[PDB]
Amino acid sequence: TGLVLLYSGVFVAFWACLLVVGICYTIFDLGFRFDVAWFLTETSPFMWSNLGIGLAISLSVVGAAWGIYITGSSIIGGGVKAPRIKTKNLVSIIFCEAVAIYGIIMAIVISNMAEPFSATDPKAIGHRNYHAGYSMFGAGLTVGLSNLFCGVCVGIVGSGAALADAQNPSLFVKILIVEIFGSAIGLFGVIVAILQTSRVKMG
Amino acid sequence: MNVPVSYNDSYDTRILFWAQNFSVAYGEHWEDLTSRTFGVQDLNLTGSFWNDTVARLVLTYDSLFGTMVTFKFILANSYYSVSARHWFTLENLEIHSNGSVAYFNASQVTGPSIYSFHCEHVSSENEDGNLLVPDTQPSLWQMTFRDFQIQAFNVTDKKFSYASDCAGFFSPGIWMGLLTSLFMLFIFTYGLHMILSLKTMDRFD
Amino acid sequence: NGPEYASFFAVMGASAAMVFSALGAAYGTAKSGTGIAAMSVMRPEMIMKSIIPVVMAGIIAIYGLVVAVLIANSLNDGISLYRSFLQLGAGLSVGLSGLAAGFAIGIVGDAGVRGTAQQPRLFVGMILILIFAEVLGLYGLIVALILSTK
Amino acid sequence: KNGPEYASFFAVMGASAAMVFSALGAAYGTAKSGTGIAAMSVMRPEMIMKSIIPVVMAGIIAIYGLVVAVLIANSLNDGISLYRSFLQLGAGLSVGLSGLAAGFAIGIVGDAGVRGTAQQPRLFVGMILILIFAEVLGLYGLIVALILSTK
Amino acid sequence: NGPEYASFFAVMGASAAMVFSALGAAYGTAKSGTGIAAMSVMRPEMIMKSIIPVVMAGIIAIYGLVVAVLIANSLNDGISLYRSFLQLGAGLSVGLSGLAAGFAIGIVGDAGVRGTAQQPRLFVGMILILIFAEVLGLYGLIVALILSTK
Amino acid sequence: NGPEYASFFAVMGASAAMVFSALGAAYGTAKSGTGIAAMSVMRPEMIMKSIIPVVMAGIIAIYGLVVAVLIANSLNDGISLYRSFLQLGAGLSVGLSGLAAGFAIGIVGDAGVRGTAQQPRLFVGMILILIFAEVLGLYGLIVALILSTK
Amino acid sequence: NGPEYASFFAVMGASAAMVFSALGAAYGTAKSGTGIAAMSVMRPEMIMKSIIPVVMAGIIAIYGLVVAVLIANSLNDGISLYRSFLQLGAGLSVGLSGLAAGFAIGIVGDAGVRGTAQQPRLFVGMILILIFAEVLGLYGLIVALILSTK
Amino acid sequence: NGPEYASFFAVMGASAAMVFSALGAAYGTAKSGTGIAAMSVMRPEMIMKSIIPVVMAGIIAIYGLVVAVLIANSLNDGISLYRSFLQLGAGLSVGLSGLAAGFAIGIVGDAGVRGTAQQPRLFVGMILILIFAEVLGLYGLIVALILSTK
Amino acid sequence: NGPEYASFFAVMGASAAMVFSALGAAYGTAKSGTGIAAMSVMRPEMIMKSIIPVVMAGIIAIYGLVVAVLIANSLNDGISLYRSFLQLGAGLSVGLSGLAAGFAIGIVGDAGVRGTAQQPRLFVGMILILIFAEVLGLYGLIVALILSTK
Amino acid sequence: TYNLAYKYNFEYPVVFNLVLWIMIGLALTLIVTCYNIWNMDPG
Amino acid sequence: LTFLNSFKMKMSVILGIIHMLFGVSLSLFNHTYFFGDTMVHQAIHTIEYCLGCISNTASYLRLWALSLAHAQLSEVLWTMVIHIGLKVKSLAGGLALFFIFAAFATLTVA
Ligand SMILES: *[C@@H]1O[C@H](CO)[C@@H](O)[C@H](O)[C@H]1NC(C)=O
Ligand SMILES: *[C@@H]1O[C@H](CO)[C@@H](O)[C@H](O)[C@H]1NC(C)=O
Ligand SMILES: *[C@@H]1O[C@H](CO)[C@@H](O)[C@H](O)[C@H]1NC(C)=O
Ligand SMILES: *[C@@H]1O[C@H](CO)[C@@H](O)[C@H](O)[C@H]1NC(C)=O
Ligand SMILES: *[C@@H]1O[C@H](CO)[C@@H](O)[C@H](O)[C@H]1NC(C)=O
């Protein structure tokens, strides 16, 4: 592997700096200089909030587009000898496209609750406002990344069902139940996402 | 030059403070109060309060914009729970005009009590990130400390302790801009990894 | 009450309970369900019977769902910092073990159904191993509920 | 009213990421499918104009990132607040990573599609229906970024 | 009492006790469960006798669960810093050595069931090396208990 | 007395004496345990003779267990910084050289057991190289003790 | 005396001299121990004759042992910062150079005993190469002894 | 005098002069020592003649040893920060150039004795390249020696 | 005079001009040295007329030796930070360009002496490309020499 | 008057802005390039 | 706990020295019952006995430490038997003690 040596050469190196930077903050006295409080407070509540709206739709469709091309190559691959697959097995495309709907439904919801203010001090920016910031990041993270994983889930099973239906016509309606449990995780993403943004209000 | 100190009556010293340039602006004029402070060796420091939780540093000068005008560094030493330490804070900076008070807010001049703060620009005239901010925005008073080091509540042997600088490897402008640039470098290196990996075929028929 | 930044670790615990369990339910169904369509071509009889590894992996997904409901409802604006750190480890305990249960399910769920297509005597033993993979998802749940409810 | 001087970095970075990440995906759809046109045309040279349908569907992904990049660049102004600038950065990632995603989806399906369409012409209406579901994912990147930038 | 962020280490001691022992028990289930199906096709007799490594992978899962519920019972607001580090080293030592015992079970548990289909003499020698791959997880437990009592 | 963070390093000395020694004990048992399977398919008489590599990897585990109870019993609230850094280097010395000694055992364990399968004259020579491989773990132990005495 | 944090560099001189030197001596045993078992199938006469690279690599371990106790005996509470850096620079100079000598013994110890089975005239020349591959660690001694004594 | 930590770069310059030089000498001894074993079974005569690269690589180690002692003899408590940076720049310039010199003698010492086995005309040619490969470390002295004199 | 740490960048430039330049000469010696031994087997006549690329690669090392002793003789305590930065860029731009120079000499010196033994018409053309590969290091001088004298 | 601190200038993040990530940017484009010329294909 | 560590280690080490003493003395009675190569052989004979008995006597220290492993888990096992089952307020004496005493019967022997 050539290009994998770059990421595995940086991740070991960056962790090796942060290890020895870590045993040189404690060992002198300089743990007061670390300040995870100053990192979460002084930056913004908007950098977390606006990233979460972006990661809500974008990381869902990067699983939805991932789910399409895995089984879309297997539709046209088996479709050469068995052309009857092109009508029945398009629901495998839909279940790896309805995951993108779960993002865009959520992404409008999280953007509906973001509102500006005038404060610039982390004591003026109250805990009602900072909690509104991270909750958009967390709910945008769990509707984006979980939809990525259920997007690749139904796509891989969709590629296998396109190959199994090429050999036998009666099989595809039996393997379709596997794609339901794969696409059920997309349903499990949005229930968390609205619940993390239920009690949230900015201002 | 040397520093002003508030030496105490009992067998100890107390708070002390240093700069190189010390200047004050009222309206438009700028006065250099650094020969009148650090070399002058005589100061009307009227009430140099100390109580081990609250100290006060007053500087009067009697030759200024018109009249006798007094500065007040109001410090504190609380107990903060989330680190379980004693964190001193410069609470306010007050300039005393004809009667009225200037009321400069100065957060993040803080530090742990055991050490001494030191900054380079503790000026007024908020531009992006200067430490001193007035309460009202078109304020008549302004000031500048082109060097700075102040200590309260743990002075020993008439000398400063270890420094707590305001400088920092990271400031909160560069520490969001990095975390977004490092965020979408990673999006790029997923996109660049796939485009760097589409070989063509060798033979054609 | 608690500090202003305190709710951050409770939010990150609420998401990490869901995403890492979703990753386990992903590989638990994709790697095993590849073997289910693999099995069906040579033996189309056990196709409705051998969908038990893809439904046990679905229980990994609802393991991370309930603790996400438990945590995100227990959130409030400005909670105490001690209560939020517990909800952070509550998300990681069920998430990474649910992530671990998915790698346990999808390997032996794929390996079991290939031998089922060659000899169906394995089917009593294969489902027994999937119970031992499922307690790995179950053990993460009971540590998450004993941590978040304190 | 006036914000920090570094506040306009994020909305500018949202404008660039709307065009960088959209062009990276749309270049994948033209290269991966355009390679499949070359392997197709040697044996079945008739359906060459018929097979620029996956290439032109990758071209809509490029103008999907262009329109939102215009709306952000017209909304730029000296001294914009941190709420206003970050709304366009989240607008940029919503359209950028979606176009980078759907750029891959048209690319692999359009490659495998025109290799299979040459050996069976019945798959053409089936291939073009999958590319509809792939290219509409780029349209989902618009109407969240169009809501975010207008807000 | 101690600092506010003191309880964060004891929470991470509770999480790393579980998620590393679960990751160890998963690989010992996965790598050995792949060997069960390869053995059962040729020798379907020793199929309930060959599930000795997969339950011995399961005992690594309960080894973490003992330490995990022990820490969650000892967690409290305002614990001192010296108490919280001891639970971090408790969960780390029972976790990563349980991950080591999970790795050691899967390699020889797979190698044992690939050989016992070819020779019944190894079935007494297979359970010897699996015990030495199990006491590594037991050594992590007895030092986790001695680190969490103090 | 010492600072509050000083007890963290001594606890890290207790864990790293365990998990690094456990990783070497796991790798030495697994790498040499695979060779027992390939040896048994032709020479099943040397099954009990071939347990001597995997028990010498077991010495590496109890080498870590001996040091781990020494560091955990010298732990106290408010130990000095000179006391704690002695215990951290004590844990790294027995663990990481034990990780090296466990690596050297498993390589000559896999080579020697396959080698003594084809010719039983290697058994008096294979045990000789394993002694030099084992004693590297002892060299970490004796410097782990004399660092922990002071 | 000196600062409170000064002992950590002198500990790291004591530990890394015992890790890295035993890390090289493990590789020199493991790589050459494979070469012993490979030639023993054809040429069983040279087994006592051919364990010269294993006992030459064993000196590399006791090279790190002698500098470890010499550093640990010089350890006092609150030593000066100049004295502690001398022990860290000594420990790195013997461990990593011993790690180099552990590499050089392992390669030619593997390849040389492959050739001494097919032609026994290499036996004078093979050990003659190993002297140059052993004195590299011996140069690491006389720089570590001169640095720790200052 | 300078700061108390000023001796840190000086002792590290004494280490890097020893490590990277002996690391270079190890690669020249091992990679070219691999070439001795393949040629000696074919052409058994030229073996005392073919140990010229492993003794030319041995000069690279004492190239690093000389500047190691010369730096270590010049160490004092509280040397100036200017004087310590020269010794760090001395040791890096001799070892890393010597490590590069080990890359040169390693390859051409391997390939040179590969072709000397098939044609003895190469021995005047191969030994001519080795002088150009060894002089790089000899260039490394006169920059390191000229640096530590200041 | 400048700051106390100002001497660090000048001695880094005095080392990086020697490390990287010798590293370029190392690859040029090694990669072309392997082509020498592959040429001498087929055509034994050209050994002095084949070592033109290695002796041109030796000039790359003497290219670095010029600026190394030049910077070290312009080096002083209390040098300005403006003065110290120039010798750093003088150090990098002659070594890394010489490293780029020896990369080109190594590649075309390898394939050039292969085709020279197969057809001697290449020999006049092989040198002509080698001159263009070498004057890249000559452009390394006139940036380093123009920077060091400022 | 004693023990006055070391006077770090006010643009310290700004130095760590433009010195650390630039030297690593440049460090890579050395190494990824030096890798690409080290094992080429003369075949 | 600290007192048992100092005493049981040295007495077991002398016990391993006593076991090696009775073993090495049997070699003299077995030898009584019946130059260049003799130097390199007896060097391997002697110094592998020298560094070898150290690893032997170090492995005699485990049989106290394995008893320390025996002692600690038996209390935890014991703790469950004495604490989770029997300290139930209402429904103890029936189904609660029966499954725990069965764990005290069957789970401790394995
Ligand atoms: C700051 O003080 C210095 C004293 O050294 C003085 O020379 C300078 O004029 C002052 N600054 C301004 C802007 O007047
Ligand atoms: C010092 O300032 C106070 C402030 O009211 C004033 O009353 C007093 O007279 C001043 N003393 C001198 C000596 O200037
Ligand atoms: C110290 O003095 C201040 C003066 O305002 C007062 O508020 C505070 O209560 C006093 N504290 C003690 C302990 O005397
Ligand atoms: C105080 O009042 C006098 C008289 O009106 C005026 O000249 C002077 O400027 C005033 N001082 C300040 C600081 O405004
Ligand atoms: C400014 O100072 C006033 C003094 O009354 C204080 O009440 C207020 O909280 C301060 N505001 C800030 C932002 O520091």
Beta-sheet strand order (sheet of B16-18): B16-18, B148-151, B116-119, B163-165
Residue ID of nearest Cα to ligand 5 atom 2: B105
Residue ID of nearest Cα to ligand 2 atom 7: B46
First to last CA, chain G: 17
- Pocket of ligand 5 contains residue A120 by CB under 6 Å: no
Which of F14, F41, F77 comes nearest E147 by C-beta? F14
Dihedral in degrees, nearest 10, Cα atoms E32, E34, E37, E40: -30
Q: G61-92 burial string, b = 16+ CB within 10 Å, else e?
A: bbbbbebbbbbbebbeeebbbbbbbbbbbbbb
CB F19 within 8 A of CB F95: yes
**What are the structure tokens assigned to K74, written together?**
């038996």
Residue numbers in D near B173 (CB within 8 A): 4, 6
- Number of domains present in the structure of chain J: 1
Q: Single out the residue of B76, B78, B61 nearest to residue B150, CA to CA.
A: B76
Q: Do E23 and C150 touch (CB under 8 A)?
A: no
Q: Hey, which residues 103-122 in chain B have their CB within 8 Å of chain A? A: 107, 111-112
Q: Which residue of E has its CA nearest to F24?
A: E100
**B82 interface with D at CB cutoff 8 Å:** no
CA of residue B38 to ligand 1 center, whole Å: 13
- Pocket of ligand 1 contains residue B23 by CB under 6 Å: yes
Which of H122, H140, H146 comes nearest I72 by C-beta? H146
Q: Which residue of D has its CA nearest to B183?
A: D93
- Pocket of ligand 2 contains residue B62 by CB under 6 Å: yes
- For residue B92, the ligand 5 atom closest to its alpha carbon is 2
Residue B26, classed as helix, strand or coil, is strand
The single-letter DSSP state of residue C5 is G
Q: Single out the residue of H144, D18, A108 nearest to residue I17, CA to CA.
A: H144
For tokens 């040579």, what's the residue?
A: C42
**Alpha helices (H) in A79-201, listed in sequence order:** 85-88, 91-95, 98-111, 127-167, 172-196
Q: Tell me the pairing of strands B116-119 and B104-105.
A: unpaired
Spatial separation of the C-alpha atoms in residues J15 and I149, rounded to whole Å? 27
**F94 interface with G at CB cutoff 8 Å:** no
For tokens 């991932």, what's the residue?
A: A66
Q: Which residue of F has its CA nearest to E107?
A: F30
Q: Do C7 and A170 touch (CB under 8 A)?
A: no
Residue numbers in A near C23 (CB within 8 A): 149
Find the ligand nearest to B24 CA: 1
Which of B82, B85, B172 comes nearest A43 by C-beta? B172
CB within 8 Å of G19: residues ≥ 6 apart: F92, F93, F96, F97, F100, F140, G95
Residue ID of nearest Cα to ligand 3 atom 5: B54
CB burial class (10 A; 0-12, 13-18, 19+) of residue I87? buried
CA of residue B65 to ligand 4 center, whole Å: 7
Spatial separation of the C-alpha atoms in residues F25 and E100, rounded to whole Å? 8
What count of residues does chain B have? 205
What approach was used to elucidate this structure? cryo-EM
**B137 interface with A at CB cutoff 8 Å:** no
Q: H-helix or E-strand containing C29?
A: helix C7-42
CA of residue B64 to ligand 1 center, whole Å: 16
Domain of J29?
1-43
Residue B149, classed as helix, strand or coil, is strand
Spatial separation of the C-alpha atoms in residues E27 and A105, rounded to whole Å? 38
**What are the structure tokens assigned to D40, written together?**
């197709």
Residue H79, classed as helix, strand or coil, is coil
AA identity, residue E61: A
Dihedral in degrees, nearest 10, Cα atoms J7, J11, J13, J19: -100
Residue numbers in H near G120 (CB within 8 A): none
CB E31 within 8 A of CB E109: yes
CB burial class (10 A; 0-12, 13-18, 19+) of residue A18? exposed
Spatial separation of the C-alpha atoms in residues K110 and K107, rounded to whole Å? 6
Q: Hey, which residues 13-72 in chain H have their CB within 8 Å of chain G? A: 14-15, 18-19, 22-23, 25-27, 29-31, 33-34, 36-38, 40-41, 44, 47-48, 51, 54-55, 57-58, 61-62, 64-65, 68-69, 72
Residue E123, classed as helix, strand or coil, is helix
Q: Single out the residue of A143, A62, A44, A38 nearest to residue D87, CA to CA.
A: A44
**Alpha helices (H) in J1-42, listed in sequence order:** 12-18, 20-38
**What are the structure tokens assigned to H87, written together?**
């010794």
CB pairs under 8 A between A and D: 150
The single-letter DSSP state of residue K106 is I
**D126 interface with A at CB cutoff 8 Å:** yes
Q: Is the dihedral of CA E11, E16, E22, E25 positive or negative?
A: negative
Spatial separation of the C-alpha atoms in residues H121 and I36, rounded to whole Å? 12
Min Cα–Cα distance to chain G from H49, Å = 11
Which of H93, H112, H122 comes nearest I18 by C-beta? H93
Kindly provide the resolution of this structure in angstroms, with one decimal: 3.8
Q: Single out the residue of C11, C15, C35 nearest to residue C23, CA to CA.
A: C15
Residue ID of nearest Cα to ligand 3 atom 2: B51
CB I111 within 8 A of CB I33: no
Find the ligand nearest to B55 CA: 3
Residue B77, classed as helix, strand or coil, is strand
Which residues are registered as beta bridge partners of A162?
A: none
CB B107 within 8 A of CB B134: no
First to last CA, chain J: 73
- Pocket of ligand 5 contains residue B12 by CB under 6 Å: no
